[PDB]
Amino acid sequence: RKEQIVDCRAVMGLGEGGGLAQRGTFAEGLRNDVVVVAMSPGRRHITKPVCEITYGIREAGIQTSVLVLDAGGGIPSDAPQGSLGSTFGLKPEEAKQVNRHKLCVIHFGNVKSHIIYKARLFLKYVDIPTIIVCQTPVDMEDFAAIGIKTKNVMPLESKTEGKIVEIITGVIRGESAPQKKIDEIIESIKKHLG
Amino acid sequence: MNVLVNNNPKSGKTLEDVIKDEYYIPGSNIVIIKGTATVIKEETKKYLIKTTKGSFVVGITEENETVDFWNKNYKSFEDKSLIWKSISDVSFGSIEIPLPVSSVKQNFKKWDVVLSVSGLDTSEGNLIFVQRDVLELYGLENPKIGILIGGKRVLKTLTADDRIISIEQMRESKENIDYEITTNLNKEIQDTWKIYTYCKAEFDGPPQSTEHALAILENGTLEISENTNTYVADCRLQTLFIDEENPEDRDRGTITVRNIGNGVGKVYIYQESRASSLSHTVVGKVTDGIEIVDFSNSGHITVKTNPERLSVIGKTQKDAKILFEKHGITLKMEGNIDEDAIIVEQVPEYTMDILKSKEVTTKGIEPEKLLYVEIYDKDAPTTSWYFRKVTGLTTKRIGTLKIYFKHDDISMFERDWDYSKGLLPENTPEKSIDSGIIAVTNMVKKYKGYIGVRTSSNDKYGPTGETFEGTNIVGKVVKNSEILKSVKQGENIYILEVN
Amino acid sequence: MYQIIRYEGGVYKNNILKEWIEDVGGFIIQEHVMQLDVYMTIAIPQNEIENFKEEAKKYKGKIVETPLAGIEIAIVSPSLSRHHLPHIACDVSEYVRKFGAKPNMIGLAHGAGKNISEIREKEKRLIQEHDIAIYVMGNFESCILDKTHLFKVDIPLVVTGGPETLDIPYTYVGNLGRRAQRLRKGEEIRALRQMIDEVTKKINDKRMELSYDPPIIPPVVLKDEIEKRIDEVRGILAPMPIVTQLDGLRIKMDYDRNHEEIENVKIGKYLLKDIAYVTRSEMKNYILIKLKSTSE
């Protein structure tokens, strides 16, 4: 039980009845232990699955920062035949803000082919162990099939400097995460952090 | 009758009489100041005092209703003694306070101005100056009126014998300056009317930026293109680059040149003391006669630059000799020595460098080696502006064109890949191009901005080897020729505009 | 002199507007580009306010008067858990942000409970470092009344809670208790506006206190000078690299490594150490700058 101070973002939210976070913003939790990365400030990501993980970690006694990606929706431009609909990316300042944390927790969606390439682009610049929280059942090997460093299934030619340290399945976008999922995430963080 | 002019009074009724002696370029603005109003307005959100123990500063914060009492009953609280200094803080008075006394009581704060009625009787209302944080102790609807901060020691040391005598407020005074702008001469002056006619500019800065400012003020007048409450700017040279940083304070009457961005090259004169800026290069200051800058909102202002612009490029050799010897500068000749030889280049070419080094190397040219050109400014405004910028005719009287590529009849000049931006097709040929025509390839072609001229005529290609839709005619060579055929690649030819 | 406002407009031709602001002597305190719109918190001299309004209406921008865009507020929640943090506390913080302030969530280590709640000295000092503190309390009158020892700081205070009216010796705003939904009902919005009005009144009072004995240099221009001189401020990864307080600044750089450089910064003709109190902050070992008054 120790005081937890958060550096709130410097910019306001999305209108009056909208979300409280803003795209492309960072909220440092002083002591940098865990950063929760949200693809967007929208209802599909913010306060339904992300602030729940945030308060779970903050209840476990681990300070948490929340970073909302400027462009977190879509697939990276390096995906086969390029991207479609939208382009996923990570800014150098975003990478630096992530890389000063001990661990990262990132929330992903449903389609497997999107998640694998998004994680590859994310870990091309992030060098700390990360935890993938997605809905679909994804195996901790399809990431290695495209080159991602993975704790259990390493690739022969690694294209990323970050290690996918845990994959947690069953967390739906825009829906309240049950206490069981929060407990699993907290246990994984505790056992893979200290 | 007897009016005060500048620093030496005059008497002439009409403006012409009093400005005859004052040097003044016609067309500029004339500033007249009538006097000072010195309006004294006091609203006193913060109130002062003159006590026997000193002077504190109170300040009303919470409106409620007791501030409305105070507004005029503070003078009724004038010359009142301290009533008590007990645990109920220090209270003064005691005079009538008709504000309805409510038994309901509200919390107050440390050193807070309070008008509580001590005893629930209208006539005994105390000016209770709270010292300590008091919880529910008092009465009245909401005695909170203001907060004491300034002179807290005065209120603390105040004893029963001491009184507040005179209740000062703050005595806040404002100033208004009467002004009218004019450019009439035949008007009647009544008496003691002050006139300003020009301003004096002292230049001290990096050589290139100062030369830019001098070129702006070579004619003695500064156009007012933009005006705000803090500056007036000149936009005659808004697309000319400079690479110099002089980031110091933009004080009152400071002259700066913006060196980056959309407004690179604008010359600013600041009417307010502002902070330093990395995008503004200070080139000097206005010493005296600031008011003409302060009050002018548009038009022309006559400006005198203390260091005369020592750039003699359109002059003859004897004029440069006499002007430089009258400034006490050692002089030497490089090119043509004849007294009527036109100067083409001077080393150093900047006034600040010349003054700091006290020597000039002047290069003249042969009478037949100077190329005479005429520039179509009305026909192709953007292209002519680009040509003037690239050849340097915007700043000096003689421009330099460098030979870039040559073959037989065609001689192409170098381009500036900084001024060739809006090179839309402007003056494109309709018939066969005649000989001795200067042209610039527009943005249509790959080699946009390259200037060239050919000594013959063809019906298919312009002077730069491009088709007619890709060349816009900017000007022609009028007098001196047969030197384009005897100049090698990389050599510079010098041009003179003859309009 | 320098009144601080927020400009909301597009990124197209925003550089020309920034050049105009630099020309007239203003400062861009905050900048954020979302996708195609940019929000700028700008401090410009009062004599150029109408000029800037005219300029903004040329770019089809919008001027929003921010009455709190010079202060940083300490929103104090009893904990960072699911009870207070993800709702109400964020609503308070974001509503404070909507008026220009810079909030900081302060989650007390032992703030929860009725008789087991306590506030540490370090948390007390950290709260005191701010300009004003907003407390987000529960929705039981007895629990709040038996919790007054929490609000012991010599800082302007606004307490929010469930019951409509409380009998604490502080400013209180009711109908803002511990909830679990986003604050979107009309009554909740009205209570948020009431809290904003209370903090605005306290801040304006404190502004008058400061105006009695003005500081030698305004905090905003001091921040601008520090940015121009110190070349490490663009490498700060914190949300607000330099925070503009009421009578000072917060520099989010290491104190042990940069206090000597910060102190030896020449403003005007003075050295910074002679006009401001540079001290280490309880906030992540940052640098806190407190301006002196003209009296000393």
Side-chain angles (χ1 to χ4, degrees):
Chain A
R1 280 242 75 85
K2 99 175 271 203
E3 43 270 80
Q4 286 181 69
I5 278 69
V6 180
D7 251 5
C8 289
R9 318 152 194 285
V11 75
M12 42 161 212
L14 310 164
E16 297 298 286
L20 301 133
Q22 182 63 264
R23 94 182 330 153
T25 43
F26 178 63
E28 182 160 59
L30 258 49
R31 176 160 86 109
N32 305 99
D33 315 49
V34 185
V35 40
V36 178
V37 179
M39 302 290 108
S40 76
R43 60 153 302 271
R44 261 172 244 188
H45 303 97
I46 273 298
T47 312
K48 274 294 84 193
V50 155
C51 301
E52 303 237 274
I53 301 173
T54 316
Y55 70 56
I57 307 157
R58 272 152 194 196
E59 272 149 51
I62 318 151
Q63 321 230 339
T64 303
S65 317
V66 177
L67 160 80
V68 184
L69 290 192
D70 197 37
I75 45 175
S77 215
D78 80 29
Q81 306 220 261
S83 47
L84 171 85
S86 47
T87 310
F88 173 79
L90 194 71
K91 285 210 283 197
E93 43 270 63
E94 290 165 342
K96 280 195 226 71
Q97 288 160 327
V98 170
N99 277 324
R100 42 169 27 201
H101 291 92
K102 285 153 206 167
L103 198 132
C104 164
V105 179
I106 181 156
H107 162 244
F108 279 121
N110 221 17
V111 194
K112 184 218 290 224
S113 71
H114 304 175
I115 291 163
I116 48 162
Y117 288 112
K118 279 174 99 132
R120 187 171 79 172
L121 187 127
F122 186 79
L123 294 171
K124 196 185 152 170
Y125 313 88
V126 175
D127 65 51
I128 57 169
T130 87
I131 298 174
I132 289 199
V133 177
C134 43
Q135 173 192 355
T136 194
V138 86
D139 159 38
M140 153 103 90
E141 169 248 10
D142 322 84
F143 297 94
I146 58 166
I148 310 167
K149 284 226 272 271
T150 300
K151 210 190 51 49
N152 280 357
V153 182
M154 213 60 77
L156 174 65
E157 193 53 52
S158 86
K159 296 154 95 130
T160 65
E161 41 246 38
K163 193 66 76 33
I164 280 170
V165 97
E166 183 87 48
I167 320 196
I168 286 143
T169 278
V171 172
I172 315 202
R173 68 204 168 280
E175 319 215 324
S176 181
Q179 181 63 53
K180 256 29 161 184
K181 289 318 176 150
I182 264 66
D183 292 4
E184 293 182 14
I185 292 169
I186 292 321
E187 282 327 287
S188 90
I189 286 170
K190 257 168 172 328
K191 150 262 291 181
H192 261 160
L193 187 106
Chain B
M1 209 291 255
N2 211 342
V3 307
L4 210 64
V5 164
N6 277 0
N7 59 94
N8 158 298
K10 294 303 167 21
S11 73
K13 315 320 294 161
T14 102
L15 214 30
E16 198 25 72
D17 321 343
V18 300
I19 74 104
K20 150 68 215 65
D21 37 352
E22 324 278 26
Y23 97 104
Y24 163 91
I25 290 111
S28 328
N29 300 93
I30 280 273
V31 277
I32 275 279
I33 51 148
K34 316 224 191 80
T36 79
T38 73
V39 313
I40 308 109
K41 178 60 72 164
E42 68 155 46
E43 177 271 327
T44 182
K45 271 264 268 174
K46 20 188 192 180
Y47 273 103
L48 281 282
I49 200 57
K50 200 286 299 292
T51 77
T52 296
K53 230 42 147 333
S55 170
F56 46 79
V57 202
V58 292
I60 66 102
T61 56
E62 173 44 71
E63 147 81 8
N64 196 58
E65 294 320 321
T66 64
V67 302
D68 315 77
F69 176 82
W70 180 286
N71 282 350
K72 79 213 82 143
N73 292 266
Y74 78 113
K75 222 41 167 186
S76 175
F77 253 118
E78 217 214 325
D79 287 66
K80 297 323 185 254
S81 196
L82 196 148
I83 293 320
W84 83 75
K85 73 178 40 62
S86 79
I87 217 67
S88 172
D89 318 296
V90 169
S91 91
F92 284 22
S94 191
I95 195 46
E96 150 84 21
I97 305 203
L99 189 283
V101 165
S102 96
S103 75
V104 191
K105 157 56 181 81
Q106 307 80 22
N107 175 35
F108 305 136
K109 206 54 53 59
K110 199 103 194 142
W111 314 108
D112 184 290
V113 185
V114 200
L115 270 156
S116 205
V117 195
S118 157
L120 332 172
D121 156 79
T122 56
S123 298
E124 46 68 19
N126 278 230
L127 238 201
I128 167 58
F129 268 46
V130 165
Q131 312 194 268
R132 294 72 70 171
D133 272 9
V134 317
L135 259 299
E136 271 57 38
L137 276 94
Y138 306 157
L140 201 47
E141 180 258 325
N142 174 241
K144 176 103 154 23
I145 155 239
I147 307 197
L148 190 299
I149 308 109
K152 186 227 76 53
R153 269 68 46 204
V154 173
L155 191 270
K156 161 263 307 295
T157 51
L158 261 163
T159 43
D161 79 81
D162 312 302
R163 304 159 58 269
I164 45 56
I165 322 99
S166 166
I167 169 75
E168 263 72 25
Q169 300 77 354
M170 86 315 272
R171 207 57 283 181
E172 182 284 278
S173 176
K174 218 208 59 155
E175 273 162 357
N176 209 1
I177 285 270
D178 194 4
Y179 90 118
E180 66 89 12
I181 195 45
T182 168
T183 177
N184 209 11
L185 268 31
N186 34 24
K187 66 98 190 154
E188 303 287 322
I189 208 158
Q190 311 320 105
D191 227 335
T192 172
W193 222 3
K194 177 66 54 162
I195 177 74
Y196 306 86
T197 166
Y198 78 103
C199 68
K200 177 48 151 286
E202 226 78 26
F203 277 170
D204 42 288
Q208 200 184 0
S209 328
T210 316
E211 191 77 21
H212 188 96
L214 279 153
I216 275 288
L217 307 164
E218 64 98 356
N219 278 338
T221 80
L222 178 79
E223 256 87 1
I224 302 306
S225 283
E226 281 114 20
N227 72 93
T228 60
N229 290 335
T230 64
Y231 68 83
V232 281
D234 196 12
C235 287
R236 276 123 75 95
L237 321 167
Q238 188 163 353
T239 42
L240 286 185
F241 67 58
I242 55 164
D243 326 293
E244 318 213 275
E245 259 81 352
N246 213 358
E248 26 252 50
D249 273 36
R250 300 175 282 172
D251 304 304
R252 179 97 172 308
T254 315
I255 318 181
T256 86
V257 184
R258 178 171 258 279
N259 55 3
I260 195 67
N262 188 249
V264 47
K266 277 158 73 186
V267 181
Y268 297 78
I269 303 202
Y270 273 84
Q271 316 163 0
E272 300 262 335
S273 294
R274 300 260 164 274
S276 161
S277 178
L278 257 287
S279 319
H280 286 262
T281 307
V282 287
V283 290
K285 208 162 190 325
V286 191
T287 34
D288 58 332
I290 312 311
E291 312 84 345
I292 175 172
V293 201
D294 274 349
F295 295 118
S296 39
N297 233 13
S298 160
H300 300 243
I301 46 168
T302 291
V303 198
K304 165 90 68 63
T305 68
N306 166 264
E308 290 332 290
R309 200 187 181 214
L310 313 173
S311 165
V312 283
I313 308 281
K315 311 270 148 205
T316 72
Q317 278 280 28
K318 80 199 193 319
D319 303 358
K321 204 52 63 187
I322 62 111
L323 190 278
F324 283 4
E325 294 292 34
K326 99 163 285 186
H327 278 39
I329 302 160
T330 90
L331 249 200
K332 59 218 64 156
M333 305 255 204
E334 212 295 303
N336 204 8
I337 311 306
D338 160 38
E339 57 100 340
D340 270 337
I342 302 283
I343 304 115
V344 138
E345 254 201 19
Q346 51 165 81
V347 175
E349 68 271 50
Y350 294 151
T351 298
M352 300 285 121
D353 296 340
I354 286 167
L355 292 167
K356 106 177 309 306
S357 167
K358 303 293 310 306
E359 69 88 16
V360 189
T361 289
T362 282
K363 192 261 209 62
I365 207 182
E366 282 329 286
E368 88 295 325
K369 193 154 305 302
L370 203 60
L371 197 89
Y372 282 38
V373 303
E374 154 157 4
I375 301 178
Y376 307 137
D377 270 299
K378 143 207 66 193
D379 298 314
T382 312
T383 315
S384 34
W385 181 237
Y386 161 75
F387 180 75
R388 283 185 195 272
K389 281 202 287 172
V390 65
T391 204
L393 275 171
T394 48
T395 278
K396 334 161 183 215
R397 256 74 56 63
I398 304 285
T400 85
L401 286 165
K402 189 195 250 212
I403 302 298
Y404 178 68
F405 166 78
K406 202 175 193 346
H407 158 119
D408 315 349
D409 195 61
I410 289 186
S411 58
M412 302 192 349
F413 313 117
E414 280 264 11
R415 86 179 155 189
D416 204 312
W417 195 265
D418 289 322
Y419 307 139
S420 50
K421 309 304 273 260
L423 279 186
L424 290 177
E426 257 193 330
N427 211 16
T428 39
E430 329 278 335
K431 43 104 192 188
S432 153
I433 292 191
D434 29 359
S435 161
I437 272 285
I438 308 191
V440 190
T441 89
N442 45 42
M443 54 157 72
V444 181
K445 302 304 186 210
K446 175 185 261 133
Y447 299 113
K448 156 199 58 175
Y450 274 114
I451 317 140
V453 67
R454 69 158 79 243
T455 80
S456 81
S457 193
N458 43 357
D459 36 34
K460 177 80 141 40
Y461 290 106
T464 46
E466 315 280 353
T467 326
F468 285 174
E469 81 255 357
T471 89
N472 38 223
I473 302 166
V474 58
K476 76 198 186 221
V477 177
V478 74
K479 182 247 215 187
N480 234 127
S481 193
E482 70 264 0
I483 77 175
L484 301 154
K485 46 205 56 168
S486 41
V487 46
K488 309 318 74 173
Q489 284 194 19
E491 320 303 320
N492 315 353
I493 56 196
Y494 303 100
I495 67 176
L496 190 158
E497 188 190 349
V498 311
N499 64 71
Chain C
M1 177 31 156
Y2 288 113
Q3 91 156 150
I4 311 192
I5 50 153
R6 177 164 77 231
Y7 170 85
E8 322 185 335
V11 296
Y12 183 41
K13 306 216 259 256
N14 193 51
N15 57 293
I16 295 105
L17 181 78
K18 292 231 276 280
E19 284 180 30
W20 186 94
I21 290 160
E22 289 164 13
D23 286 351
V24 308
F27 318 100
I28 291 105
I29 291 160
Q30 174 111 54
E31 224 210 318
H32 202 252
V33 167
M34 286 85 209
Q35 158 183 353
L36 289 157
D37 35 30
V38 50
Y39 283 17
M40 272 175 338
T41 299
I42 319 146
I44 80 150
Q46 264 135 0
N47 41 294
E48 294 269 37
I49 284 305
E50 337 295 0
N51 291 107
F52 184 52
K53 277 158 155 156
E54 193 30 74
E55 218 69 28
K57 92 151 50 66
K58 145 197 311 181
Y59 300 115
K60 304 225 222 181
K62 165 164 189 44
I63 300 302
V64 172
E65 280 282 352
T66 56
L68 302 172
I71 62 152
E72 73 167 353
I73 314 199
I75 289 109
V76 200
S77 141
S79 94
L80 291 206
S81 60
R82 78 231 288 144
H83 300 76
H84 338 83
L85 174 90
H87 272 308
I88 302 304
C90 34
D91 309 69
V92 171
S93 255
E94 203 270 331
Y95 216 67
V96 156
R97 257 178 272 143
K98 204 174 311 258
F99 297 100
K102 168 66 175 89
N104 291 324
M105 203 60 60
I106 319 287
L108 296 190
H110 295 324
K114 194 177 159 142
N115 327 312
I116 50 161
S117 66
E118 83 175 62
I119 176 158
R120 284 329 181 62
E121 204 42 71
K122 153 144 71 168
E123 318 163 327
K124 217 174 275 222
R125 262 178 333 250
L126 176 43
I127 291 167
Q128 264 135 27
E129 276 179 3
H130 294 71
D131 291 349
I132 185 162
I134 298 182
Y135 278 80
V136 179
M137 287 306 69
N139 35 53
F140 292 132
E141 214 144 300
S142 146
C143 282
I144 294 176
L145 277 188
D146 171 351
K147 227 177 189 162
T148 278
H149 70 304
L150 279 199
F151 342 112
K152 275 336 286 173
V153 285
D154 49 79
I155 308 294
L157 272 192
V158 168
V159 175
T160 47
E164 185 133 344
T165 282
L166 246 284
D167 215 34
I168 48 172
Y170 311 93
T171 300
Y172 184 87
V173 175
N175 307 331
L176 289 175
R178 173 240 161 161
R179 273 115 184 266
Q181 303 240 204
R182 176 98 164 89
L183 286 183
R184 80 170 36 96
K185 298 190 171 61
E187 206 292 321
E188 322 175 298
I189 294 310
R190 272 195 311 99
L192 279 181
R193 300 250 196 71
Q194 163 152 37
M195 161 207 72
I196 282 317
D197 282 345
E198 300 275 357
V199 308
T200 292
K201 168 184 291 104
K202 302 209 152 206
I203 261 53
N204 278 15
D205 300 354
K206 192 79 48 211
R207 244 198 267 289
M208 281 321 72
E209 267 107 355
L210 260 304
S211 169
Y212 278 4
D213 199 9
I216 183 49
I217 204 192
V220 38
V221 315
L222 179 57
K223 158 210 211 264
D224 175 47
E225 201 86 23
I226 275 158
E227 290 185 342
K228 267 190 266 134
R229 209 76 81 264
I230 316 290
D231 267 40
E232 293 80 351
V233 306
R234 85 291 291 263
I236 305 177
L237 301 171
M240 187 136 260
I242 298 181
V243 189
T244 295
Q245 311 221 4
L246 211 33
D247 63 338
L249 296 166
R250 191 199 291 283
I251 319 276
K252 309 211 171 133
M253 318 170 15
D254 216 335
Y255 177 83
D256 299 324
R257 186 145 37 280
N258 297 108
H259 74 94
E260 66 277 64
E261 168 67 284
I262 285 290
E263 285 160 338
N264 303 336
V265 167
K266 33 198 55 73
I267 47 56
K269 55 94 148 166
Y270 303 81
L271 270 186
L272 189 88
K273 47 164 42 143
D274 318 316
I275 88 173
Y277 285 109
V278 170
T279 169
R280 187 200 270 95
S281 165
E282 328 273 320
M283 164 139 179
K284 219 194 142 175
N285 205 82
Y286 289 154
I287 302 163
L288 180 81
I289 290 196
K290 296 274 135 216
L291 285 163
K292 287 159 212 196
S293 30
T294 63
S295 75
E296 72 276 347

